[PDB]
Design a protein around this ligand. Structure first.
Ligand code: HEM
Ligand code: HEM
Ligand code: HEM
Ligand code: HEM
Lengths: 146, 141, 141, 146
């Protein structure tokens, strides 16, 4: 990335305090609620008729954990997101048909979830580093699209 | 909002399209597929090969919709309601893609109506596609 | 379009902001400057250093306008006519930037209103900022 | 910049036919007319009140030629746009305070201008090549942004 040692340390340090289980479920659910059109990919999950129905849907929470899991692992290859997400990039394009703009929406949702959770701790400079990360991830994931 | 001038410009330029609307619609799609490959994610079920009948068929449908919006330039929200519903509830195309298609429609018109594609007309057509896009996205949330 | 639930949600959330709107205005700007440095191009005449009085003052102004908007949630276009004018004819901020400030505002509210920043409230506020953005860029052309 | 050899030949072949003076003036003028907010940088150019006042303004024409001139040079260094555009990138940021979004708007306008001029010759695939190029140039111009 174009992350500063200081930017890398801030990312890394906050992440260490994250419950991926909880943040993953919340991030994905918020996505489905704020940007309802993203539900187009999760018809099989069930009832996403209400915020409550989305936030409570176990399938949402479980997919949320899977996605953040994968994200979490990419934070260890911050200097080669491209290579880390290559296979996932193909899958998303060729099998899932997910428009890369979704990656960007989630990224922003993720940042709102972190601010939500960390309050004070999530400072302007920490947000700035995360914004670089989420953009980086979105790009990596979109890289293999053709 | 579209001004009287804008409306005149659009009716004029679209007037020239005439019977080629269909072909220009198909061409705009193809340009879009080639330039902004991400848009292809919405047509996994289509044959996107050059001269695809699916693309031809779709190009016509889009062109008809635009022609209908021009015909009802003073009542677009109502003339496009049905299509607004479809995109919001079924298709659920991410809003950013409207700008991409809009752009490819402008390129197509430019490539075909050199005499009419004046700066003034270009500005009017851009405002118009923006308004159509806004209508089609209005019921998203 | 803002539903009645939306308007309720917004009014509730903003209600909680209270005497901190100005500080949150300043915080969202600071967050904007750092995360999206392209936004800085519009404030060459400001001291963008942390805790700058120019930034604080401007933060107050923005916050106040939002307040006014929430208050006239039913008549935004009218409530913000002056501001839409200013931005369209004087400031001429590119429309892409509104989405950036909007995002930094959500982040700021989330960071400060934990209990209140529920998924439904999040959805409402986003829509709200979106509408406000629409109003502010409506007379651009 | 994923310019395949055939994409590069295509850009170069067409670029051979362009009257940079002419296209330069047309592209800048059209920008000022389609996205009137962009007029904010040229209050010293005089009368930009109507399309004809813009399109025929001797200052707009001369500036357009200047801009497309730098662009043309860029086309001979498709390999090193960032390097090519570095001092200009700095100037646009630090001295002119030009939001980079301006660079993307101009690129789109230029594409419409090339379509306008070449008609049928500006095929779908040629457009796709130029789309990559204007993006690459806008990116290069924004690169020194801070
Ligand atoms: C941070 C960005 C993302 C990451 C790291 C990511 C990662 C993953 C992973 C690891 C899987 C597991 C699939 C497998 O291995 O077979 C998956 C599946 C999937 N993802 Fe993504 N994802 C991301 C964003 C998104 C977004 C934003 C959407 C749509 C809103 C999406 C839609 C899906 C769907 C529909 C599946 C298939 C799940 C199933 O088989 O039911 N992903 N993703
Ligand atoms: C202003 C621009 C647009 C117009 C006028 C338009 C209009 C239409 C129309 C008339 C149809 C066919 C509905 C029917 O079956 O009767 C349609 C379908 C569709 N559109 Fe839109 N649309 C626009 C933008 C977009 C964009 C930007 C995308 C995605 C990149 C898109 C994706 C689709 C898809 C996937 C379908 C279904 C096609 C099929 O399965 O046959 N549309 N649109
Ligand atoms: C949520 C949307 C926004 C609102 C409610 C808003 C509100 C305002 C207000 C209340 C003022 C002060 C008017 C005065 O001086 O009397 C202002 C000025 C200004 N705004 Fe907007 N603004 C918004 C978005 C933006 C964005 C996104 C930018 C640029 C990134 C921007 C750039 C400016 C600038 C440069 C000034 C003048 C500052 C000065 O010289 O004092 N605004 N805005
Ligand atoms: C392909 C993109 C562009 C290129 C290659 C380019 C190139 C140039 C060059 C070579 C100069 C003269 C440098 C000097 O004065 O030392 C210049 C100046 C300038 N550019 Fe850019 N430019 C581009 C896009 C833009 C856009 C889109 C805008 C605004 C909408 C803009 C705003 C300006 C301004 C305001 C000046 C100074 C004019 C004056 O002399 O007062 N440029 N540009």
């Amino acid at each position: 990335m174009h992350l500063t040692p200081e930017e890398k340390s801030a990312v890394t340090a906050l992440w260490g305090k994250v419950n991926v289980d909880e943040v993953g479920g919340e991030a994905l659910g918020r996505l489905l609620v704020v940007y309802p059109w993203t539900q187009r990919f999760f018809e099989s999950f069930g009832d996403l008729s209400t915020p409550d129905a989305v936030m409570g849907n176990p399938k949402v929470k479980a997919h949320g954990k899977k996605v953040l899991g994968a994200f979490s692992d990419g934070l260890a290859h911050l200097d080669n997101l491209k290579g880390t997400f290559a296979t996932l990039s193909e899958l998303h394009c060729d099998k899932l048909h997910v428009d890369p703009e979704n990656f960007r929406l989630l990224g922003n949702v993720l940042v709102c979830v972190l601010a939500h959770h960390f309050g004070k701790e999530f400072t302007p400079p920490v947000q700035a580093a995360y914004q670089k990360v989420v953009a980086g991830v979105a790009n990596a994931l979109a890289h293999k699209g053709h | 909002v579209l001004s009287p001038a804008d409306k005149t410009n659009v009716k004029a330029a679209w007037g020239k399209v005439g019977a080629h609307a269909g072909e220009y619609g198909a061409e705009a799609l193809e340009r879009m597929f080639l330039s902004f490959p991400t848009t292809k994610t919405y047509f996994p079920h289509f044959d996107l090969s050059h001269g695809s009948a699916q693309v031809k068929g779709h190009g016509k449908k889009v062109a008809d919709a635009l022609t209908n919006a021009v015909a009802h330039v003073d009542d677009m929200p109502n003339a496009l309601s049905a299509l607004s519903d479809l995109h919001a509830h079924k298709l659920r195309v991410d809003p950013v893609n409207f700008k991409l298609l809009s752009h490819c429609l402008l390129v197509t018109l430019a490539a075909h109506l050199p005499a009419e594609f004046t700066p003034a007309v270009h500005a009017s057509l851009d405002k118009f596609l923006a308004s159509v896009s806004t209508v089609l996205t209005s019921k998203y949330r």
